[model samples]
Target: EVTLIVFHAGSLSVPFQEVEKEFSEYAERNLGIKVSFQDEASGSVMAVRKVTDLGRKADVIGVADYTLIPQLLIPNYTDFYVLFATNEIVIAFTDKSRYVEEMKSNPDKWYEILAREDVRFGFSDPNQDPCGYRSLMVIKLADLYYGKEIFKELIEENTNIYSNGTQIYAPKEITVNPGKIVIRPKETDLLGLVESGSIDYIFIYKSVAKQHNLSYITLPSEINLGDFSKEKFYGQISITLGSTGKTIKAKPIVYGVTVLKDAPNREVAIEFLRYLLSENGKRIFEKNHQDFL
Candidate 1:
């Protein structure tokens, strides 16, 4: 029996499971190998740390932001990666959330609504997840688009930072007011909190909101980081995160996957990756709300 391990972004969980099942069957029937998957999910940054910092080994690593591969891993853990999918950022909420009617009716007034003292929202740590920093970029862009200081009012004035005992550093722009904004290690982790009404809304990937069957208000392509043509606009904002002292320029959200340099099951890993990049795998991602790149 061969065990293939995968460390992936939390948002990829649903579609990755389907890839696992499909590959397991393919490997057994064609390659005559009994394949089993050991899968783990977290913030893309945290997931990479599991191998780069903790000394764990995985056959493959899939990240929500393609740039993280070159910024965090690469050269040491792996040499190359394939850009496979893309996503957009959105404000996700449930029916029971505060001001649901107001948000639904005046979707354009989301920033204003969230600014209300009575509303509470959440986002992942900028040091841990792409979605986290991207959320900040979105807010900053909103500030410009709406001619309002939303980022300063909603995040800079409301956020605080604490070390998670990891080498990663927090974005310099964050300074929170404690209770108004909840922070988790990954964007998807906030889903449960939102569903339970603990958080009125969360900044997350659009695909994740759809996968979880939550309601989301779509932001303009200018701020969502989903439009490749808006790359120049996105690049106007830059964020420095993690202790690595790396500055990330906002860009379209593209997902990447790669086989690790020291993968124990190299042959099986390659075969699985081949299938993941195939047309069938594209369909699986699309079925789960992700867009193939």
Candidate 2:
């Protein structure tokens, strides 16, 4: 069976699509195998749940947060994983958004703008997405960065997720003030809300905003989780996910890819992974605006 089942993060869709396409041709010409891919995009957590909990077998697993592989899938699903790419959290919006001009002039006032009741914002579900939990991490870190209760004024006031001044707790069902907030399973799923003016802003990956050509406000290195150099500072806060009861600390958002130990086409899967980690893979990711590791 010249088939590969690739289950990857929603944020990895555009780049992984290219990887799948180019690698299929490379497979045909170099390996003499007409390998066709069955690619699935979901929250990175869900991608793992598919195999670990849903009984689905994926040849390749790529996730936005590399820690997912080690935290949930290691030693049981796969012995190890490869860190491949990284991204930062950004608040994306369109020209149609309210305060679009004010935000352009004073990026530091981003928290104030988001706090406005007239301005609705969205992020993925913390129970199901790294982007979701990381969104909270950024907000909490913003309080530490700007010395303001940005987390309380924005997140705690808007959703059921709360903090005790030291750590945040996200309930399994993150009930939101729909009038001022929106929630989805993954950050990419919020794209439609931003595009249609259904929501004024969203906390998503910098690369996702770049790929979609959307205007975004970049958060500082201390909070964006983009600067690998700031890992120590980033770890100052953590969130306890309600669904799995797992606690995750803030860290640079590095991506990871792995081949399942029980992959149906194990040999072909390894070769595809080798190609995905080659120079061509780096080229593809960077071309898509995602930084390769």
Tell me how far the alpha carbon of residue 133 in candidate 2 is from the true structure, in angstroms, after superposition: 0.6
Segments in model 1 whose C-alpha atoms lie over 4 Å from true places: 161-175
Superpose all Cα atoms of candidate 2 onto the true structure and report the RMSD in Å to 1 decimal.
0.9
Q: How many clashing residue pairs are found in candidate 2?
A: 0
Q: Estimate each model's TM-score.
A: 0.94, 0.98
Candidate 1, residue 288: the lDDT equals 97
- Per-residue CA lDDT of candidate 1, range 13-117, in tens? 999999999999998899999999999988888888888889998999999888889987879989999999999999999998999999989989999889899
TM-score, predicted candidate 2 vs. hidden true structure: 0.98
Task: Give candidate 1's TM-score.
Answer: 0.94
Which 10-residue span in candidate 1 carries the lowest summed lDDT?
160-169
